[model samples]
Target: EVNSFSGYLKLTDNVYIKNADIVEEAKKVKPTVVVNAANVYLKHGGGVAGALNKATNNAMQVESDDYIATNGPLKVGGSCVLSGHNLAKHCLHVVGPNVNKGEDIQLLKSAYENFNQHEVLLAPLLSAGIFGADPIHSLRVCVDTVRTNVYLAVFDKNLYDKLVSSFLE
Candidate 1:
């Protein structure tokens, strides 16, 4: 359900991208050669549908902005405010469970951290308690943390599916 990108990469659709294996969807949105054809553009588009954080930031990801967009809760693990690359209309930055920055690591460590820290690291919860670590409640946080190239190194099947469904409309 991806729409055309506005000047700043904002999409009109309420796409629940999450972890829907958007690689196929990205290819479908591939722009014409006259404009700019690049595989990186396709990978960058993954962010709109909750792409792997690594892909969105990968120097080797996509290389165009025609299909760049952010969908669902885009969970960015770092505090970097840098401009997005290959973003179509707009690039939105979301904060996820950041350990080094005092944020919870995510579902993987939420249970342990939640009980030990007694603080909700996710902004959505805003200082909530252990319940904030629920899997369904922290889908995007988990997905973004795992889907990225660096995160993908440890992502599991359950985490992947949850990410896709989180943003799917």
Candidate 2:
């Protein structure tokens, strides 16, 4: 059931989406820019909740693109730095705490809830914690708590080597 949602949501200027031919819009937005989308929603075992995994996973599984950028901290506290415990190499950011709501995925739901209201506020906050001045180790701990997925870029040989070294070392 596609129930309409209403609230004080704020849409930003640079958020590109694939809901209605976003790829075409992305192509027109810039010559060659990284156009990405991030989605968060709550779901249960039945209804559209069950359908979410298939829909979202399929959307995320597209491999033809040069790079895939997940739009959140990849959970409540994930980041985009090079590390092992970190999901920067392509993951989702879930901001909500895990709850016993048998019919709901709280973490994912919280991510979407927070996002719908103040996504503009979220962007810089995520960047600051992930790639900002904070220690990488600390950031990793925070993000790992919620198990969010941070996005990783398409890599060549050299970049691949660098990532391996950064995380494993």
Candidate 1 local lDDT, 4-118, one digit each (tens) = 2221211122112222232322233321100111122233342322342343455423322322454222233322122333432222223334333455544233322221221
- Judge candidate 2 at residue 61 and give its lDDT: 32
Which sections of candidate 2 miss by over 4 Å?
Answer: 1-19, 31-73, 76-104, 113-169
| Candidate topping TM-score | 1
Error of 1 at 67 (Å): 22
Candidate lDDT values, in order: 0.28, 0.25
lDDT of 1: 0.28
Residue 104, model 1: lDDT of 53
Worst 10 residues of 1 by lDDT: 31-40
Error of 1 at 39 (Å): 24
Which segments of model 1 are wrong by more than 4 Å?
Answer: 1-19, 22-84, 99-134, 139-169
Residue 155, model 1: Cα distance from true site in angstroms: 9.0
